[PDB]
Ligand binder design. Structure first.
Ligand SMILES: Nc1nc2c(ncn2[C@@H]2O[C@H](COP(=O)(O)OP(=O)(O)O)[C@@H](O)[C@H]2O)c(=O)[nH]1
Ligand SMILES: Nc1nc2c(ncn2[C@@H]2O[C@H](COP(=O)(O)OP(=O)(O)O)[C@@H](O)[C@H]2O)c(=O)[nH]1
Lengths: 332, 173, 337, 172
């Protein structure tokens, strides 16, 4: 175990360039990646609605403590006072957990633990059951597009309306957990530093990123962001994202008259509402790739994997919920 | 000295986290992790810094790994030779993903689990799998317009090194 | 409490060395190189006498240094190879290998580590010499390092046996210092020359060396031996400055009348070789400092700095042996007048 | 803006110990001070402090090659219970700094404040002589430096001061 922690941390100091020359990546992004790869690895096995096996739960616990530790040490160095048993006041410099890490780290761990628990509320009888993907009973049973998951089945003719009541209660419990994590993920990326590379790649002026059509719209006398959007093609996720990228570039230009900027920012908000599950934007991808700050790296990276677990689990609930709808249908 | 970022994409269960693990260490498991790995390799006299990237798990959540496609020099696109579904998805699902996210970036096409594909026993035993034949790979390779198709097996290690050599070759040439 | 202790060390290194999170600190290599040097400093700073390093300080040194060095176990050469099964099928593979300069050196530096520590163990038990409390009456009646405790010796000086014993020990230890220093030098020589350093280099070889020195390494004749005998080498600062102008010039030359610059360079490197010969313990040169300041190779950072602390520990111990030896000499004289 | 603050001096003078106390508010009952950086706020602007220990570089010149490179300010500490540390500041420290890092400013610090007017201590350690705050000043004005502070890691008296002072001579 110490033998096994050592291997872990050592490869982070290399980061991740196995050949010495730390040409190579940041303790931040070493960290970010490692948290990602671990979570992917562990929940890659959550292919059914059931408690995470106890050995797995154990391994996830410790290795995530390991990766999370650096944050115990990231501080604010702040002047302060202290007085002795005898009454003498002495000016000191004191230490404290840096701001975003004091509240969010605990907050993120409590989500982690809530996920793990909702899976524990599956320990023992479940009115639904899984068959192996490659066996005959599987071949007869949303599913065909993820050929690797075991097909879930539910009793011929619905399932108990307690057993279905509960699954909804959990589809919701979990969706709210997902939303929480995303909200943290969001926050960090906005407090992340804008990469020199990104600036460099930016066009000359606001009318280049938005281009002239969209420029006329955020630039006329009237404006209301609701209508603005009803006038653009948002049919695909790729199209919405191309816009998000153009709006973000502009904002970043103008913060280096403010009416536009204010409206541009109003439009992004509206996007984050209408389009919550949206992949990340050019700027986020970049903030992440060139980010040197291990505090935020752990924060964004960790909220990201939790986002994903919560989604994995609610897919596994939607899996059963809907082969349930199909059970009522084929009863006709 | 150049850098090569080499991302392996493919469906779940098709076995990459193993191909990557096996290339890199000469093992084969049973948890199962391939942390991002970079190392110096000599190709034909000149030395090259190769970066190996797994995508395990993002078959489930689009937002899990935002870093996979950014600046990639070559893809390894794997399907499982015992899965007609992964075969169909290369065309239906992976090619559009790569056309979009990293246009014009070379693809090495790879079929995995070589060692199961003429295992008569295995298929009576797992009625749902279907072996893909080397021809169908070749055919597919032409279809997606990729330069080279390799079949390999991380259990036996057959052709594993071949694949990555081919990923490297195509970035250099 | 140990798994606890270790996390802390490692966590602080990922931070590197910027406790305020932003990884606007130093590289991992430097962070690592630094913590090795500070660990050594604190542990050996108590080695104030000739005696066994206390049992528990021997213990902390061992595991802390262990933690620090482990990164080396993961630094590799990734090379092609071959592999055959029980059945006979030969299959081509990539294989893994500890990188060349850590394969032999790390064990060798560790071999010096233990030789030093156990040189200190050979002082278990009776020693004809004793140490006295620095601020005592005894102490008051090399007074330079005022912070060490003064040695005293029997009023008649030491005994042939415990004196022969000490010389043999001085010799043993100064060979360990020579060794460690040799590794320290190899690796410095194999370390990247920093963009910072080049930027600050003059235009011409003439400008680095100076017109006078230039004329010297540039004539028909040249015996590097007389070259040095002609200069002023009287103080350590003057020698170090010469070393610097030479090193800079070689950098200029290597980077770039045509033919004969091979010669100048041959000679310049010849003179650097001599300087190590004549001036074995010089401080770091400017290009050494810079190599270290801006080095990014974890492997070399560990090699460079481990050898550096070992060099130092060894030198500290001879410094003790020489203290008794010296007061013993004072004991013989003052016992003859 | 970044400040490299090295603190130099004799052995046994309190250094590595000051530092530990500035930075964590503890003593020693091994004392190690690893290289430390933290963000600091000074008059609204934010500076990045760099703290450097030298302990060792009093047994081997070759041990710490990075101490003087790019140094922004020195803290030159001597023990207020050591005439020899006092005498040494001139005989040894000033000549180093004047060579390796000319013109870089120097804060002068007498350490071990708590022991100086301690009468029983000097009966117990006859070889020690206490330095007077005046002699402190005299030294200050001599070595040509702007600030003299006396502090104690033990009591923690004036420690923050020392550093605030170090920070100030760099910012102005
Ligand atoms: N028999 C066999 N199984 C393999 C081979 N390569 C991978 N697998 C299996 O593939 C399954 C999952 O593959 P994995 O490495 O996780 O791929 P991934 O999940 O897409 O990342 C595991 O059960 C492995 O046993 C192979 O060459 N032979
Ligand atoms: N009373 C008192 N004792 C101190 C103070 N600072 C250090 N000491 C003691 O004096 C020695 C100081 O040595 P140290 O902190 O290691 O300084 P260094 O050796 O120069 O690095 C240690 O034995 C400390 O316990 C202080 O401020 N007050």
């Amino acid at each position: 175990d110490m033998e096994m922690m050592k291997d872990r941390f050592a490869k982070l100091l290399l980061g991740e360039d196995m050949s010495g020359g730390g040409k190579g990546v940041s303790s931040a992004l070493a960290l970010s990646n490692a948290i990602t790869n671990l979570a992917a690895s562990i929940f890659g096995e959550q292919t059914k609605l059931q408690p995470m096996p106890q050995d797995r739960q154990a391994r996830w616990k410790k290795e995530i403590d390991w990766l999370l530790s650096v944050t115990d040490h990231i501080v604010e160095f702040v002047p302060s006072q202290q007085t002795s048993k005898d009454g003498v006041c002495t000016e000191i410099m004191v230490t404290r957990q840096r701001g975003d890490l004091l509240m969010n780290i605990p907050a993120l761990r409590k989500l982690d633990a809530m996920l793990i628990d909702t899976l524990d509320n599956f320990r023992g009888h479940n009115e639904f059951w899984y068959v192996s993907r490659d066996s005959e009973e599987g071949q007869q049973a949303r599913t065909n597009d993820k050929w690797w998951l075991p097909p879930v089945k539910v009793p011929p003719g619905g399932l108990s309306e307690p057993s279905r009541r509960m699954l909804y209660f959990q589809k919701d419990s979990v969706t709210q957990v997902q939303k929480a994590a995303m909200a943290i993920n969001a926050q960090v990326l906005s407090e992340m530093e804008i990469p020199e590379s990104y600036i460099d790649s930016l066009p000359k002026n606001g009318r280049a990123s938005l281009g002239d059509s969209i420029y006329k719209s955020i630039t006329e006398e009237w404006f209301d962001p609701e209508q603005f959007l009803a006038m653009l093609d948002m049919s695909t996720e790729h199209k919405v994202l191309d816009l998000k990228n153009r709006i973000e570039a502009s904002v970043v230009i103008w913060k280096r008259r403010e009416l536009f900027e204010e409206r541009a920012e109003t439009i992004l908000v509206l996007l984050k509402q209408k389009f919550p599950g949206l992949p990340q934007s050019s700027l986020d991808i970049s903030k992440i790739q060139f980010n040197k700050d291990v505090g935020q790296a752990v924060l964004e990276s960790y909220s990201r994997i939790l986002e994903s677990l919560a989604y994995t689990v609610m897919s596994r609930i939607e899996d059963v919920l809907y082969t349930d709808t199909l059970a009522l249908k084929q009863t006709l | 000295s150049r850098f090569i970022k080499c991302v392996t994409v493919g469906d779940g269960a098709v076995g990459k986290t193993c191909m990557l693990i096996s290339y890199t260490s000469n093992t084969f498991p049973t948890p199962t992790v391939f942390d991002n790995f970079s190392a110096n390799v000599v190709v034909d006299g000149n030395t090259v810094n190769l970066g190996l990237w797994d995508t395990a798990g993002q078959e489930d959540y689009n937002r899990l790994r935002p870093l996979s496609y950014r600046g990639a020099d070559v893809f390894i696109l794997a399907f499982s030779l015992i899965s007609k579904a992964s075969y169909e998805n290369v065309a239906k699902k992976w090619i559009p993903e790569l056309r979009h996210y990293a246009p014009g970036v070379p693809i090495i096409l790879v079929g995995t689990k070589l060692d199961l594909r003429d295992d008569k026993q295995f298929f009576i035993d797992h009625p749902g799998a279907v072996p893909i034949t080397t021809n169908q790979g070749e055919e597919l390779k032409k279809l997606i317009g990729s330069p080279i198709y390799i079949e390999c097996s991380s259990k036996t290690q057959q052709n594993v090194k071949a694949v990555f050599d081919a990923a490297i070759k195509v970035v250099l040439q």
